[PDB]
Amino acid sequence: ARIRHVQGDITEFQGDAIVNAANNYLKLGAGVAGAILRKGGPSIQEECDRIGKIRVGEAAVTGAGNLPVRYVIHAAVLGDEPASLETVRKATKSALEKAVELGLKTVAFTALGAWVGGLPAEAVLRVMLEEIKKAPDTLEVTGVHGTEKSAEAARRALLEHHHH
Amino acid sequence: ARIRHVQGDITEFQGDAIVNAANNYLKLGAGVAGAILRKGGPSIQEECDRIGKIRVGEAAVTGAGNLPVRYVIHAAVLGDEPASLETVRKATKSALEKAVELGLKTVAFTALGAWVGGLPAEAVLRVMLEEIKKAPDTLEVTGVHGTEKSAEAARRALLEHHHH
Ligand SMILES: [Cl-]
């Protein structure tokens, strides 16, 4: 899959889906999830409740309420178990599998497990990169950053990856 | 499994096994492998030749020649595929599985894939840590560093891991 890094607010992403760093109970609270629930509205949590508890490392899809995306993909990175590079790998892979299963073309992510999970961003981005490279080229992943300095860094890393 | 970080020369490790960062052809050359072959002698490569080509992510055990260890565990982190956090995870896990299968008590590792593979040490150590925690407590893993500053850093990281 293709990758781009930009500065912005993931809740204003205007594509097919955004990926939420979720707990395995799919309870929207800390981090981006809170923003997702405020701007997308109550229907997102209600749909999550219909799904019920999942497994750390799994992903689940709901509608995106009042957000300008089609879907929210809830990638469970923690909950009964603490976040780790392994849960981040599995959840990123599960999120990608849902995107491909729905024939999505544009999907936004943040650095799963690096905020609420406590993991270092550099390691998280590397495992995400490894999983994203396995998805088909019909899919474009956008990493959304709070800062241009942040986005420029990941962009620099991504160019360094071509040597070789 | 228990973990300790010390400064030293892994080829002088005086326990059950040392883990070699190998290619999947088990050809000893670049990095620690070269030191292993010089100090352990030709029998190590000869035994590797008897084994033949393995798979990136797998591990293989040989005798340690003139080294003061019982076994060399060749953890294949690269070769037909470039080194990645995923191959490092699989190889570390494969290396640990061989150690447990032989009832080993003390095993030394370096940061697999961080030298010859080009991966950043901090990410490599984190995935190794996650795999080592799954091995039984009968096993003690020693990380061997060229520098005390290096070992102290990993030791500091390991203490930070207890919060929580
Ligand atoms: Cl990983």
| CA neighbor of B97 nearest in space, from B56, B57, B51, B124 | B57
Amino acid at the residue A128: M
Expressed in angstroms and rounded, the spacing between residue B38 Cα and the centre of ligand 1 is: 32
What 3-state class would DSSP assign to B41? coil
Is B86–A89 a contact, with Cβ atoms under 8 angstroms apart? yes
**Residue environment code for B77-108, b if the CB has 16+ CB neighbours within 10 A, otherwise e:** bbbeeebbbbbbbbbbbbbbbbbeeeebebbb
Amino acid at the residue B87: T
Closest-CA distance of chain A to residue B50, Å: 32
Alpha-carbon radius of gyration of chain B: 14
* Residues of chain A immediately before an interruption (C to N > 2.5 Å): none
CA dist list (Å): B23 to A83, A138, B48, B54, B117: 31, 33, 11, 9, 10
Cβ pairs bridging A and B (under 8 Å): 29
CATH of A1-164, one of 3.40.50.10190, 3.40.50.720, 3.40.220.10, 3.20.20.80: 3.40.220.10
Return d(Cα A60, Cα B60) in angstroms, integer.
39
Q: Report residue A10 as tokens.
A: 């993931």
Resolution in A: 2.2
Is A85–B126 a contact, with Cβ atoms under 8 angstroms apart? yes
Return d(Cα A144, Cα A114) in angstroms, integer.
13
Please compute, for residue A145, the number of CA atoms within 13 A of its CA located in the half-sphere on the CB side.
15
What 3-state class would DSSP assign to A120? coil
Phi, psi of B115 (to 5 degrees): -95, -75
Return d(Cα A114, Cα A92) in angstroms, integer.
13
What 3-state class would DSSP assign to A108? strand
DSSP B72: E
Return d(Cα A51, Cα B69) in angstroms, integer.
54
The 10 Å Cβ neighbour count of residue A151 is: 18
Closest-CA distance of chain B to residue A85, Å: 7
What 3-state class would DSSP assign to A106? strand
Q: Which residue of B has its CA nearest to A128?
A: B85
The 10 Å Cβ neighbour count of residue B155 is: 17
Query: How do the domains of chain B map onto residue ranges?
Result: 1-164
HEC readout, A57-80? CCEEEEECCCCCCCEEEEEEEECC
Is B89–A84 a contact, with Cβ atoms under 8 angstroms apart? no
Q: In what order do the strands lie in the sheet with A17-23?
A: A2-7, A140-145, A106-109, A17-23, A71-78, A59-63
Return d(Cα B136, Cα B85) in angstroms, integer.
23
